[PDB]
C-alpha cells in the first residue's frame, strides 16, 4: 500500500506551493489537460491562482484532516478541509476534493476548479468588494482630540490656469509669498514626473486662515490624519503612513487605501485603531451572476482610546523645554496616571503623516539632538535626585542615622589611598553635613561615605525592592531600569558613584516617576498608567513609612532653605518637595563633558500631582528647575 504513500505527499507539497504563494511551482505538479485530468494548462492555472488569490490577498493556507484512498488503477481520489487568511478575515472551514494520477511514477493532481475556492466550477468567476473602516480617535483624560481623522485645506496649484511665461513666473513668486512657500519648491512639484498641465499638483496644508489666492491656486478639501498639539506630542502619539504592499504581504487583514501607524501609540494601538474591513467575498456565475458568498461582515470601526494624558499639561511640559534636548514626566503619582510625556527636540507629526519633502526628513534623521528619540523612555543616570532612594534605603536598615553628623572638610574625598587619584566631589564646602544639610546642598561625599558604609550587599537589598529589571505594563517601548551592568559592582568606587546617581545607572525618566512614587503613598510604589480605564497596580513596602517622614520634610528644605538647591522655586508660593540634580556624562574623545540638569517635584500636602523634567546635554546656566515654575503652577492648581 506504499501508493497511498505518495499520494498524501502530492496533496500536501501543492498546498505548501500555494501557501508559499509559489504559484507556478504548484502548477507543474498538476496533470496534463484532459477531461479525466487536469482542467487547465500550468501557464492557465499559474494566472488563475495569482488573479484570484491575488485578489483577496490570500495568505496562510493550511489545511487539515486529509484523507488519500485509491478508486480505481490510477484515480487516487482526495479530501481534506483548510482554511486561509483573506482581506476579510479568517476563511475557516472550507472543504476541498479532487482526485490524483500516479501513471509513471509521480503523482500528480488533477487539478479542478473546486481547488480553488470549494464550489468552483468551470469558468466561474470571483469577486471582492471592500468598505474602508474609519481609523479611531486618541483623546486625552479629558476627551480633548490628540489624533484623530478630520477634514483638511489642501493647498495646491495647476500649472494650465498659472499663465504662459512672465506671467506664471509672477504668480509662482506670489504663491510663494502667500503660503510661506519656498519659491524655487514651487516648481519642484510643478516639474515632478507625475505632472500633466491640467493636474492638481499638492503643495502645503493650511492649518487654518486660507488667505488670498493667486492665478492658479486652488484649496481642495481632503479627509485625513490631524494631530493637534502637533509636535508637543509627536513622539509619544507618532504618526501613520501611507500602507505598502509588504504591510498588506504580512497583514492582509489591512487596507490598501488606508493609513497605519508607524511609530509611537499610532503603531503601538495599530489593530485597535484601525478597525476591521467590511464587504463580501462572492463567487459569480461565468456571466458575472453571483453565486456563492464566502465571506462577508459589516465595517466596524477603529476603537478610540483614552489616555491619562492632560493635553494642557502635555503642551506645558513640551513649551517649557524651550526646543532644548530634554524631557518630562508629570503624574498623578498615587495612581500612576501619566499627566505629560513630552520630549523636546521634536518632529512635526502632521508634516510627516500628510506630505513632507526627502529634505525636511533628512533634516530629521541628520540633527544631531535626534528629534525622533522618545526621551521620556530613555535611559539615563539619574544624578543627584537618586540620593533620596539611597537614603531612605539608609534609613531603613538604620545605617544612616538622620541626626548623626558626618564632618567633611573639603569638596574631595577618598575612602582610602586604593582609590588613587579618583576622589568623590561635591560643590558645596559644609563642615558639618548631616542627612538634612547633604540633601540640600546635594553633597555627594555624604552619599558615597554612608554608602559605602551601608556596604553592597545591604545597598542592593533595598535596590532590589524597586522595579529594577521590570518590564512596566505600558504601550511604550522601553528597557528595564538596571543597578548596574552585572549583579556585582566588585568596585568599591562603582558602589559611591551609585549612591548619589551616578556609576552605572540607568533609569528613564517613567520609571524615575515610577520608583520616586514612593515619597507620595508612605513608602508604596505605584505604577505608571497611561490607559485611563486601566486598574491601578502598586507594591507595598518598598521603603519604610518612617523613612518618607524623614526625608520628605528635608525635601521641603531644598526649596525652603536659602542654599537649598532648589530655591528658585520658592517664589511659587505652593507646597514643594522638590529634588535636584546635575548628572555627568563622560566624552569619547578629548572633548569637555556633557552634563544632563534633573528635577523632581511633587505636592506634599495632597500628593495630587509629581513631575520629574530633565535636560540633556544641558547649555550653560540652563537647567529643569529654571523651566518649570509653568508647570507646577498648572499641576498644583489641577490635581490634588
Ligand atoms: C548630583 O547630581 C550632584 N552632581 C555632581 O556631583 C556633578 C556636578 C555637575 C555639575 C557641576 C558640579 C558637579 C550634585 N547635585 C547637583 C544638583 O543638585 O544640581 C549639584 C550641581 C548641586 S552637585
Same mark, same amino acid.
Given at each position: 500500500?506504499?501508493?497511498?504513500?505518495?499520494?498524501?505527499?502530492?496533496?500536501?507539497?501543492?498546498?505548501?506551493?500555494?501557501?508559499?504563494?509559489?504559484?507556478?511551482?504548484?502548477?507543474?505538479?498538476?496533470?496534463?489537460?484532459?477531461?479525466?485530468?487536469?482542467?487547465?494548462?500550468?501557464?492557465?492555472?499559474?494566472?488563475?491562482?495569482?488573479?484570484? *488569490?491575488?485578489?483577496?490577498?490570500?495568505?496562510?493556507?493550511?489545511?487539515?484532516?486529509?484523507?488519500?484512498?485509491?478508486?480505481?488503477?490510477?484515480? *487516487?481520489?482526495?479530501?481534506? /478541509?483548510?482554511?486561509?487568511?483573506?482581506?476579510?478575515?479568517?476563511?475557516?472551514?472550507?472543504?476541498?476534493?479532487?482526485?490524483?494520477?500516479?501513471?509513471?511514477?509521480?503523482?500528480?493532481?488533477?487539478?479542478?476548479?473546486?481547488?480553488?475556492?470549494?464550489?468552483?466550477?468551470?469558468?466561474?468567476?470571483?469577486?471582492?468588494?471592500?468598505?474602508?473602516?474609519?481609523?479611531?480617535?486618541?483623546?486625552?483624560?479629558?476627551?480633548?482630540?490628540?489624533?484623530?481623522?478630520?477634514?483638511?485645506?489642501?493647498?495646491?496649484?495647476?500649472?494650465?490656469?498659472?499663465?504662459?511665461?512672465?506671467?506664471?513666473?509672477? =504668480?509662482? /513668486?506670489?504663491?510663494?509669498?502667500?503660503?510661506?512657500?519656498?519659491?524655487?519648491?514651487?516648481?519642484?512639484?510643478?516639474?515632478?514626473?507625475?505632472?500633466?498641465?491640467?493636474?492638481?499638483?499638492?503643495?502645503?496644508?493650511?492649518?487654518?486662515?486660507?488667505?488670498?489666492?493667486?492665478?492658479?491656486?486652488?484649496?481642495?478639501?481632503?479627509?485625513?490624519?490631524?494631530?493637534?498639539?502637533?509636535?508637543?506630542?509627536?513622539?509619544?502619539?507618532?504618526?501613520?503612513?501611507?500602507?505598502?504592499?509588504?504591510?498588506?504581504?504580512?497583514?492582509?487583514?489591512?487596507?490598501? =487605501?488606508?493609513?497605519?501607524?508607524?511609530?509611537?501609540?499610532?503603531?503601538?494601538?495599530?489593530?485597535?485603531?484601525?478597525?476591521?474591513?467590511?464587504?463580501?467575498?462572492?463567487?459569480?456565475?461565468?456571466?458575472?451572476?453571483?453565486?456563492?458568498?464566502?465571506?462577508?461582515?459589516?465595517?466596524? =470601526?477603529?476603537?478610540?482610546?483614552?489616555?491619562?494624558?492632560?493635553?494642557?499639561?502635555?503642551?506645558?511640559?513640551?513649551?517649557?523645554?524651550?526646543?532644548?534636548?530634554?524631557?518630562?514626566?508629570?503624574?498623578? +503619582?498615587?495612581?500612576?496616571?501619566?499627566?505629560?510625556?513630552?520630549?523636546?527636540?521634536?518632529?512635526?507629526?502632521?508634516?510627516?503623516?500628510?506630505?513632507?519633502?526627502?529634505?525636511? *526628513?533628512?533634516?530629521?534623521?541628520?540633527?544631531?539632538?535626534?528629534?525622533?528619540?522618545?526621551?521620556?523612555?530613555?535611559?539615563?543616570?539619574?544624578?543627584?535626585?537618586?540620593?533620596?532612594?539611597?537614603?531612605?534605603?539608609?534609613?531603613?536598615?538604620?545605617?544612616?542615622?538622620?541626626?548623626?553628623?558626618?564632618?567633611?572638610?573639603?569638596?574631595?574625598?577618598?575612602?582610602?589611598?586604593?582609590?588613587?587619584? #579618583?576622589?568623590?566631589?561635591?560643590?558645596?564646602?559644609?563642615?558639618?553635613?548631616?542627612?538634612?544639610?547633604?540633601?540640600? #546642598?546635594?553633597?555627594?561625599?555624604?552619599?558615597?561615605?554612608?554608602?559605602?558604609?551601608?556596604?553592597?550587599?545591604?545597598?542592593?537589598?533595598?535596590?532590589?525592592?524597586?522595579?529594577?529589571?521590570?518590564?512596566?505594563?505600558?504601550?511604550?517601548?522601553?528597557?528595564?531600569?538596571?543597578?548596574?551592568?552585572?549583579?556585582?559592582?566588585?568596585?568599591?568606587?562603582?558602589?559611591?558613584?551609585?549612591?548619589?546617581?551616578?556609576?552605572?545607572?540607568?533609569?528613564? +525618566?517613567?520609571?524615575?516617576?515610577?520608583?520616586?512614587?514612593?515619597?507620595?503613598?508612605?513608602?508604596?510604589?505605584? *505604577?505608571?498608567?497611561?490607559?485611563?480605564?486601566?486598574?491601578?497596580?502598586?507594591?507595598?513596602?518598598?521603603?519604610?513609612?518612617?523613612?518618607?517622614?524623614?526625608?520628605? +520634610?528635608?525635601?521641603?528644605?531644598?526649596?525652603?532653605?536659602?542654599?537649598?538647591?532648589?530655591?528658585?522655586?520658592?517664589?511659587?508660593?505652593?507646597?514643594?518637595?522638590?529634588?535636584?540634580?546635575?548628572?555627568?556624562? +563622560?566624552?569619547?574623545?578629548?572633548?569637555?563633558?556633557?552634563? =544632563?540638569?534633573?528635577?523632581?517635584?511633587?505636592?506634599?500636602?495632597?500628593?495630587?500631582?509629581?513631575?520629574?523634567?530633565?535636560?540633556?546635554?544641558?547649555?550653560?546656566?540652563?537647567?529643569?528647575?529654571?523651566?518649570?515654575?509653568?508647570?507646577?503652577?498648572?499641576?498644583?492648581?489641577?490635581?490634588?
Amino acid at each position: 500500500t506504499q501508493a497511498v504513500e505518495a499520494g498524501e505527499k502530492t496533496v500536501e507539497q501543492f498546498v505548501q506551493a500555494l501557501n508559499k504563494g509559489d504559484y507556478n511551482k504548484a502548477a507543474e505538479m498538476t496533470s496534463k489537460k484532459a477531461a479525466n485530468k487536469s482542467a487547465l494548462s500550468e501557464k492557465e492555472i499559474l494566472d488563475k491562482y495569482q488573479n484570484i *488569490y491575488g485578489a483577496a490577498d490570500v495568505k496562510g493556507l493550511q489545511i487539515s484532516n486529509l484523507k488519500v484512498d485509491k478508486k480505481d488503477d490510477s484515480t *487516487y481520489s482526495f479530501s481534506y /478541509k483548510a482554511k486561509m487568511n483573506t482581506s476579510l478575515g479568517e476563511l475557516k472551514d472550507l472543504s476541498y476534493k479532487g482526485t490524483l494520477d500516479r501513471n509513471d511514477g509521480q503523482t500528480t493532481i488533477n487539478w479542478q476548479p473546486n481547488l480553488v475556492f470549494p464550489e468552483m466550477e468551470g469558468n466561474d468567476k470571483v469577486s471582492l468588494t471592500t468598505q474602508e473602516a474609519a481609523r479611531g480617535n486618541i483623546i486625552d483624560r479629558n476627551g480633548e482630540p490628540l489624533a484623530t481623522t478630520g477634514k483638511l485645506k489642501q493647498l495646491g496649484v495647476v500649472p494650465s490656469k498659472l499663465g504662459d511665461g512672465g506671467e506664471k513666473t509672477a =504668480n509662482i /513668486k506670489a504663491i510663494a509669498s502667500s503660503f510661506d512657500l519656498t519659491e524655487d519648491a514651487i516648481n519642484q512639484a510643478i516639474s515632478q514626473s507625475w505632472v500633466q498641465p491640467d493636474y492638481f499638483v499638492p503643495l502645503k496644508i493650511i492649518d487654518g486662515a486660507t488667505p488670498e489666492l493667486p492665478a492658479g491656486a486652488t484649496i481642495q478639501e481632503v479627509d485625513g490624519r490631524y494631530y493637534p498639539l502637533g509636535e508637543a506630542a509627536a513622539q509619544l502619539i507618532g504618526y501613520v503612513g501611507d500602507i505598502t504592499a509588504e504591510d498588506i504581504d504580512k497583514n492582509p487583514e489591512l487596507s490598501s =487605501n488606508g493609513k497605519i501607524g508607524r511609530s509611537g501609540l499610532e503603531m503601538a494601538f495599530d489593530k485597535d485603531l484601525r478597525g476591521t474591513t467590511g464587504g463580501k467575498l462572492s463567487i459569480t456565475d461565468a456571466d458575472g451572476v453571483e453565486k456563492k458568498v464566502l465571506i462577508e461582515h459589516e465595517v466596524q =470601526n477603529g476603537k478610540d482610546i483614552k489616555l491619562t494624558i492632560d493635553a494642557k499639561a502635555q503642551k506645558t511640559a513640551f513649551d517649557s523645554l524651550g526646543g532644548k534636548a530634554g524631557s518630562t514626566v508629570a503624574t498623578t +503619582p498615587k495612581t500612576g496616571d501619566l499627566l505629560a510625556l513630552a520630549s523636546s527636540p521634536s518632529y512635526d507629526p502632521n508634516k510627516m503623516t500628510n506630505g513632507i519633502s526627502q529634505e525636511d *526628513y533628512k533634516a530629521y534623521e541628520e540633527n544631531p539632538e535626534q528629534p525622533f528619540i522618545s526621551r521620556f523612555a530613555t535611559g539615563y543616570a539619574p544624578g543627584s535626585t537618586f540620593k533620596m532612594i539611597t537614603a531612605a534605603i539608609g534609613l531603613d536598615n538604620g545605617t544612616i542615622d538622620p541626626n548623626e553628623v558626618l564632618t567633611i572638610n573639603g569638596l574631595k574625598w577618598q575612602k582610602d589611598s586604593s582609590w588613587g587619584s #579618583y576622589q568623590v566631589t561635591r560643590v558645596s564646602d559644609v563642615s558639618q553635613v548631616d542627612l538634612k544639610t547633604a540633601l540640600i #546642598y546635594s553633597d555627594n561625599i555624604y552619599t558615597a561615605q554612608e554608602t559605602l558604609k551601608m556596604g553592597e550587599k545591604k545597598f542592593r537589598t533595598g535596590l532590589d525592592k524597586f522595579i529594577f529589571g521590570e518590564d512596566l505594563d505600558l504601550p511604550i517601548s522601553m528597557n528595564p531600569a538596571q543597578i548596574s551592568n552585572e549583579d556585582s559592582f566588585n568596585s568599591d568606587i562603582l558602589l559611591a558613584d551609585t549612591g548619589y546617581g551616578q556609576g552605572e545607572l540607568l533609569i528613564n +525618566p517613567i520609571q524615575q516617576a515610577a520608583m520616586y512614587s514612593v515619597f507620595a503613598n508612605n513608602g508604596t510604589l505605584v *505604577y505608571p498608567k497611561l490607559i485611563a480605564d486601566k486598574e491601578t497596580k502598586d507594591k507595598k513596602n518598598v521603603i519604610g513609612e518612617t523613612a518618607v517622614q524623614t526625608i520628605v +520634610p528635608d525635601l521641603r528644605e531644598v526649596v525652603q532653605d536659602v542654599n537649598g538647591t532648589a530655591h528658585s522655586l520658592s517664589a511659587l508660593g505652593i507646597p514643594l518637595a522638590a529634588k535636584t540634580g546635575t548628572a555627568e556624562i +563622560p566624552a569619547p574623545a578629548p572633548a569637555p563633558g556633557k552634563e =544632563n540638569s534633573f528635577l523632581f517635584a511633587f505636592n506634599p500636602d495632597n500628593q495630587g500631582y509629581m513631575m520629574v523634567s530633565m535636560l540633556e546635554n544641558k547649555e550653560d546656566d540652563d537647567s529643569a528647575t529654571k523651566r518649570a515654575s509653568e508647570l507646577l503652577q498648572y499641576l498644583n492648581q489641577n490635581y490634588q
